[PDB]
Design a protein around this nucleic acid. Sequence first.
DNA 1: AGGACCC
DNA 2: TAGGGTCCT
Length: 373
Amino acid sequence: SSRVIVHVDLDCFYAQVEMISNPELKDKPLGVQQKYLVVTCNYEARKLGVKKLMNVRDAKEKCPQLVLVNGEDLTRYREMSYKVTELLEEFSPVVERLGFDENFVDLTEMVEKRLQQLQSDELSAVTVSGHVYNNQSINLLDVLHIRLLVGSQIAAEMREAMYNQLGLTGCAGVASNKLLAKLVSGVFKPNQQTVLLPESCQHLIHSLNHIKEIPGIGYKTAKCLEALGINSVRDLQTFSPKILEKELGISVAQRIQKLSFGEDNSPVILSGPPQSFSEEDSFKKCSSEVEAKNKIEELLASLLNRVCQDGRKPHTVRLIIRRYSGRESRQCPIPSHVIQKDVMTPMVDILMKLFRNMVNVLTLLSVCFCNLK
DNA sequence: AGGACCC
DNA sequence: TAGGGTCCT
Ligand SMILES: Cc1cn([C@H]2C[C@H](O)[C@@H](COP(=O)(O)OP(=O)(O)OP(=O)(O)O)O2)c(=O)[nH]c1=O
Ligand SMILES: [Cl-]
Ligand SMILES: [Mg+2]
């Protein structure tokens, strides 16, 4: 059975949130800085050659008038990220988050419901909303085309709601599985949407210039695949199944080979409430294990306010570190009476004991709360 | 714990 | 070269 999936992906999300706070940043090229990294920038800045994730130096050298704002505190972006998801959940309850500014929504049931409500004459006036990938011709007698055009109409409505209710612009992609939705959502940026009819699936997949660009294939699998002389999507498409299982295991092998064909049966899962709460900090160095205790107290402070607000309780805590010049973690359950909520001083002895069990009394420190209930 | 992947 | 997240072995 075919599906209609939508992938919603916001424009320069952190930048966009900062530009709604202080409008004085509109019309100015804008980057959001975290330590020595420009994590994202507005499209005014991408015109000037600034790119996502280039360090501050490279960015000021390329754009000396670039405005930098600090984005080390995710509180505002996180609040907005969930307003967006909750809005999308109004359309269909089953919404899958991916990072802070992407959502998958399975529009299938919605699409069929709207067609059940259309009169025959009304069914030939069905029009696309936005771009059709590869400028492909629509065949109104093709049931799949009709369903994907309705999918595109719902997408437009979503985007219109996010601008009208939260003042946010973004892109959307409508396709038949999650993978295709997310590959097509990027074809026209910013603030536009694109629909992929089936005939054009191979065109879209082959539009990629290397397997790294396929969601599901990262730095490890990519580098592994290169060692086998697989560099294009068609290489992976035509590569030998058996040989691929042996180097990657039947799992990674079969899933990514199907991906290379545009085929993706994975369902849109309901993300619901977060599975974990964490904060972290990086620095030049921290060999003051008494000072590390101060940093840990600061991290833990905010997390308490956040986890409290959620209304569920974590039954496990974790501490994470990174050694000089490759991360390590140590966890433990959370004492039952401690869950009953001065909870700091208790937690600080726990985390420090976890600290010392990991290090003998320094470039990162992180606290995670998981096992929520 | 760690590792892979994602944004 | 940041600050987050998911799920699997
Ligand atoms: C990929 C990535 C994103 N982010 C944050 C910054 C981004 O604003 C936000 C969403 O990431 P993206 O959707 O990848 O990028 P974007 O929305 O900023 O840019 P685009 O307009 O091209 O879609 O998440 C990081 O902090 N680190 C990362 O490595
Ligand atoms: Cl499968
Ligand atoms: Mg985005």
